[PDB]
């Protein structure tokens, strides 16, 4: 059964659009302006190919919420629907955003850390559209591989976190404190989603991924964003 | 209603695989023969990776209309249709199709410019198979990120364009020609086919599009292949 | 008609499921352990990215494994089955296979390998799903792409075959004894299976394809992970 206010959910993946797609425009827009807080144009003239990819993810996000309100907004299921198929659309965005956070840090291992959260999310995608007993079978397979994922990047985390500046420093404590306080946050809503024990319905699940995606994307891409700025403002501006 | 003439769409997809995939094999074959127009086999024995890039997206798009051409020579829609969700095929070539270009003149932000163009088809392939008035919702979000995408690129590619002498400049001249005058007819294709206002069937919208991979992708990459030999025939053949 | 023993079937990818996968995580482990048969920890620190790939294959191949188990275990066709469309779990593995070899042995275009066994497998998807005379269509299609990869990746695997040592020589040749040996065994497989001759049944072509995911990716893996020890063992760990 799936019959709930469509345009109180279109609004909000519309809202979620503008301010998700309009907060990747700034981290290009600030990308493409200086090295750091000042206006210097990079060394070689321009800016690394992947400190862009923090604002591509918004973008990429925007749009898939710019379809997701279309889906909502037509009152159903909509043949190029990004809403039946739950955290599919994920599936583009998260294995670019922990890649976009190893790059930041230069984690080693981003080739396994891709794979862990693009094989996370593919558990997620079956765990959803199986209607017996087997989903929490996707479901714990896909927590195989995203506990590993995490134990190991907050051991890494910390291992770069020490030596940053502490002006450089506060921006990354926000970083894993949505890294690691809010992307665990999303194996937790499936199992009360109606999915599992029941307690949150279809609707509010929506609504609830709409401000988790305005955390870990948007948000969350600020902070890198600024974060960046202050780590190249101490290295390459200041040469410590 | 798609009642068409698939003998002759099928002929059609089979003559362009024929010539697509050909010269896909030319552009391989001229590329790993000599560093120009003569025969150095380069300074490391083998050319770069992405050199071989525009061979290989013809030979993808021969390979696509191989499978067009079956689908259509079986008689309708094959349960391995290439031709049922429009601008689909177009995903896995477009954004090799601009990397390409963007790695032949080294034009910066080539993963914001893959991600304008994987984005800007993914729109394409809603837009087709939404049958409500929000077919073109996704078309003009599709569009907001061909604009900004074409208009820039126009911008970069001029400030590579004065540089290259002469010789090597009339054929990023064409090159530009069919990137600019070719691309943006595929959205004008969109409002005037049978989606849109109407004035072209559904069998007409196939033969366009094939004579259109014939020259953004085949003959594309002629030229793309004759002006890489030619800007590595200045540079590293003369010393200029 | 397909009506077989699925507990049979899922116990098969179940426990195929725990050999690859557990396969992987000894790759993994036996990667950041040391550079050669040694405990050095690289130069750098870090094993490169790429190097971490033959686990992640077995990895993913074992996750795969387990939503297999999954599907039979259910008892027919789940809504998320890897087991209903053939070879298009495999698109996502063997490309990313050969590209690990392609590495190892560091062998001219890995790009062109990389879209030869890409392509290579959505002519066996397409294949598979049609059911006309078309399927041998989309058949020659992809041997197409396959006869020319395997040629001409044997020429290069002989280039590169004798520079190598004798004792890192024995594990190149096993290598290439699954790659030359195996991967041409599954085009074979599908001429006689119940698609084409018919001599194999569905339920045997499991199995078989079970065994064959044994020996291409987890076999396979380890005698890269050997290979690449011995390989490193013999140029920075002795200097020659
Ligand atoms: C726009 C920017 C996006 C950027 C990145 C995109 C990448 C992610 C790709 C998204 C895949 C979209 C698939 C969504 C399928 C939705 C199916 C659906 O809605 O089914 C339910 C709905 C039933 O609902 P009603 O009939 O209203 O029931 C009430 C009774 N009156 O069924 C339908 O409408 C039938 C669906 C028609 C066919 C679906 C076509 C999906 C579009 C195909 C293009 C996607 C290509 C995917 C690649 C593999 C090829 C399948
Ligand atoms: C070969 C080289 C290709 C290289 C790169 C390929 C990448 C692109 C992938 C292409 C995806 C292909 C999807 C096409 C689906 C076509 C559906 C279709 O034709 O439906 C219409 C047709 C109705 O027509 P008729 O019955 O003739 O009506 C007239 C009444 N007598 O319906 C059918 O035939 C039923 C369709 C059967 C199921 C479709 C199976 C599609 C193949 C699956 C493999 C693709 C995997 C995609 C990944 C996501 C998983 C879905
Ligand atoms: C888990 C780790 C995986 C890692 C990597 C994954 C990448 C590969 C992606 C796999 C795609 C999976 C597609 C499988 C579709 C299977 C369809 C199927 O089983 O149909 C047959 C079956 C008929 O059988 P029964 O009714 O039992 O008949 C007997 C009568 N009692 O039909 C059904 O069950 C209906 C199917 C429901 C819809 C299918 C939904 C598939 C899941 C969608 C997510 C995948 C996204 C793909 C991207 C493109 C969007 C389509
Ligand atoms: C079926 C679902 C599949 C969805 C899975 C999504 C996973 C996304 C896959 C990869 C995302 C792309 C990011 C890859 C890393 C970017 C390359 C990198 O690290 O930089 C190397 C280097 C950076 O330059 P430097 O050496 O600093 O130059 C100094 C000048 N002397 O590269 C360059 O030179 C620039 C060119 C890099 C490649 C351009 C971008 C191509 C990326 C491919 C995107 C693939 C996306 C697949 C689908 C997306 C769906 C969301
Ligand atoms: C769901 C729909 C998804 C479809 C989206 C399609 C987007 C395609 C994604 C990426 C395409 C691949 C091109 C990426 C750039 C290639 C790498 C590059 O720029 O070169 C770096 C460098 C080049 O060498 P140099 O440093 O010059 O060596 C000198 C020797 N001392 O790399 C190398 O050393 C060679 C190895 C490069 C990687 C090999 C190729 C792997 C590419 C992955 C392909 C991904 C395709 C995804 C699906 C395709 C569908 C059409
Ligand atoms: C629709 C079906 C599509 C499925 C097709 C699957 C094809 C898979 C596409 C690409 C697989 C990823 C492998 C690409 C090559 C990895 C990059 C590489 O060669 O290394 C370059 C270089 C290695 O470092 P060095 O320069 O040695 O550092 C020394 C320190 N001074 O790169 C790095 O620095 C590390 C960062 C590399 C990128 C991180 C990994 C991102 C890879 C994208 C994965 C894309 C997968 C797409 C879907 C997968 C489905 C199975
Ligand atoms: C619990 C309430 C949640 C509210 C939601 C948040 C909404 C967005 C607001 C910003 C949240 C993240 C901010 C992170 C902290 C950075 C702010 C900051 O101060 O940054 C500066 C500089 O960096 C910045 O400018 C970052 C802040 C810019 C954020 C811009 C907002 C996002 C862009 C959206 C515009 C388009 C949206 C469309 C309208 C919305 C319609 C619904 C760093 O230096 P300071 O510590 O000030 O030191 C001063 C000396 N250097
Ligand atoms: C409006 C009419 C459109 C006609 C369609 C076009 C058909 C293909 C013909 C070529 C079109 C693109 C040519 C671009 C310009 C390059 C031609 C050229 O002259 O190139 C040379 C050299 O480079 C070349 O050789 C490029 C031309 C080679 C093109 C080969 C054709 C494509 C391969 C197809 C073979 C297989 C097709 C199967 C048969 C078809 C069955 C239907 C560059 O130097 P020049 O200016 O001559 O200076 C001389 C001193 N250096
Ligand atoms: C026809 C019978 C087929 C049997 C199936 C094979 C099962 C797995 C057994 C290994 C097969 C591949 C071995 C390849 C050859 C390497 C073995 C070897 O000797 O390696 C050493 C060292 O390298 C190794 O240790 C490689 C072997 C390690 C393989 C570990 C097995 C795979 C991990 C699975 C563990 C988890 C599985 C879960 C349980 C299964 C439940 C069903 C290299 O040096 P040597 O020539 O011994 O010289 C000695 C002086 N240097
Ligand atoms: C309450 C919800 C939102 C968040 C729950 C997780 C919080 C408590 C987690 C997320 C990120 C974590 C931080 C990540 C990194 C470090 C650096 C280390 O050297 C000291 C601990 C410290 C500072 C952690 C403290 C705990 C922390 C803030
Ligand atoms: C009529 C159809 C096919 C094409 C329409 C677009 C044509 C007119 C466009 C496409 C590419 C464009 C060229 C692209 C780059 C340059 C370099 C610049 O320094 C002068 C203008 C010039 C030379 C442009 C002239 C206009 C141009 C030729
Ligand atoms: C293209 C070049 C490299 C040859 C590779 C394709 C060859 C091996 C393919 C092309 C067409 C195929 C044949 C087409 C149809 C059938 C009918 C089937 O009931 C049995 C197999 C059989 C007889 C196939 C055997 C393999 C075959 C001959
Ligand atoms: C019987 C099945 C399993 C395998 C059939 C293919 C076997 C015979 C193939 C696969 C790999 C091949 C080897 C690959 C590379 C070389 C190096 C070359 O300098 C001499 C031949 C030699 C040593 C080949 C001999 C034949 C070989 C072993
Ligand atoms: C912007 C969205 C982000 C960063 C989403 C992240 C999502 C996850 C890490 C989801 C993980 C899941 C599991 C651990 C297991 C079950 C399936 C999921 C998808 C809910
Ligand atoms: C070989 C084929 C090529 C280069 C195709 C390019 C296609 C486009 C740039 C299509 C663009 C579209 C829009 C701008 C908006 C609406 C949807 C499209 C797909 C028609
Ligand atoms: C672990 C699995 C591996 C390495 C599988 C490899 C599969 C192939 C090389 C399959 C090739 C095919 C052809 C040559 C043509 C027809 C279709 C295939 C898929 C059977
Ligand atoms: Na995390
Ligand atoms: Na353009
Ligand atoms: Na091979």
Known sequence: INDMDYPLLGSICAVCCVFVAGSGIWMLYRLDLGMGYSCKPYKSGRAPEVNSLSGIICLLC???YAAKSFDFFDGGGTPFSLNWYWYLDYVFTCPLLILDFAFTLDLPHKIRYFFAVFLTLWCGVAAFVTPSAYRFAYYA???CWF????LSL???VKERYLVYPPKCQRWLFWACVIFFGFWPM???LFIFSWLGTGHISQQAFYIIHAFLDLTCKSIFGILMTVFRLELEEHTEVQGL
Do not use: D
């Open 62 to 64: 925007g749009t898939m």
């Open 141 to 143: 397979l896909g927590c």
């Open 147 to 150: 506990t590993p994922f995490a």
């Open 154 to 156: 907050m051991r890494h």
């Open 186 to 188: 999303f194996p937790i």
